[PDB]
Amino acid sequence: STGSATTTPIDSLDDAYITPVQIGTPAQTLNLDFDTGSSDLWVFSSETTASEVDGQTIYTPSKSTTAKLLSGATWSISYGDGSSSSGDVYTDTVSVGGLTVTGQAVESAKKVSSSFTEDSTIDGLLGLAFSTLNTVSPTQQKTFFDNAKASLDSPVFTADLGYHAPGTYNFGFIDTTAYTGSITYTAVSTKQGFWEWTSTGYAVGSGTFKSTSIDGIADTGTTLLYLPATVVSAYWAQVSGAKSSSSVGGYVFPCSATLPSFTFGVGSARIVIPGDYIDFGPISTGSSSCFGGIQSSAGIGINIFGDVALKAAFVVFNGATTPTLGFASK
Ligand SMILES: CN(C)c1ccc(C(=O)O)cn1
Structure with missing residues (x-):
């Protein structure tokens, strides 16, 4: 079925x-x-x-x-x-x-x-x-x-x-018509009950790719992308006027900005999140301060590939005897 x-x-x-x-x-x-x-x-x-x-x-x-x-x-x-x-x-x-x-x-x-x-x-x-x-x-x-x-x-x-x-x-x-190119599969740990996997690194905008292991979960029920503070700081440093606001509860940026893309690694493959996907709009109605879609996981204890990341991909949750995750561009 x-x-x-x-x-x-x-x-x-x-x-x-x-x-x-x-x-x-x-x-x-x-x-x-x-x-x-x-x-x-x-x-x-x-x-x-x-x-x-x-x-x-x-x-x-x-x-x-x-x-x-x-x-x-x-x-x-x-x-x-x-x-x-x-x-x-x-x-x-x-x-x-x-x-x-x-x-x-x-x-x-x-x-x-x-x-x-x-x-x-x-x-x-x-x-x-x-x-x-x-x-x-x-x-x-x-x-x-x-x-x-x-x-x-x-x-x-x-x-x-x-x-x-x-x-x-x-x-x-x-559905082989729903994505472009090939699906790259990557290992899953079920030890914490999550679809937990390890990204192979990231890039900000047109910048060079940083090879680094980032363990996190594929989580459709989380809106944003939560990553280590080092990665998130490197992203927002490329947006003029962006800052972390303790009062708002994360990174905010001027609504006049054009956001850079964010790339994450899946094995040797790359998924590109367009800058627009990272814009969560005014912090309050009528504000010119906008809420960022990439936030630090430091308070959380786990990195979370939420909707911001997943929506840039076609994602396979493979529940075979040894589960795996697959990602394709689309
Ligand atoms: C509607 N709200 C309060 C929700 C919905 C979903 C989740 C979640 O999946 O973690 C959290 N809050």
């Missing part, structure tokens, strides 16, 4: 991407944030504290003839941006782009933090990291991908995120 679904930016900055997902019988369609950095499929629901729901579409398990309470199971998760959610668990039928999994754990939120409430466009998350990170207790649950894998034509999914445009998540096949 295979599946193919369009993923759409939630706003004009590509702050996140949402993908429609069918849950239950009859189908209830929710728009979920596909997150290769976590491993829980959770949704706003009829159980979510009413004051914490503001415009989201909810899953109502009592209206699904295939929903079953997973008795005794609870979940609770916190994300790198400080947001969080928790609740109980149902199993139900879940379909993405025509690919159906029966008995998928659907984690129903009883509580969500303010940043979830405030984002009316995101109805929940669909985790695509390794199932070892799943938070359900006392019986850990599998991701949608793990549950689907054995049935797929090939044990893979691909992320093809758009810049200020829709893109595609495919399951079970590689």
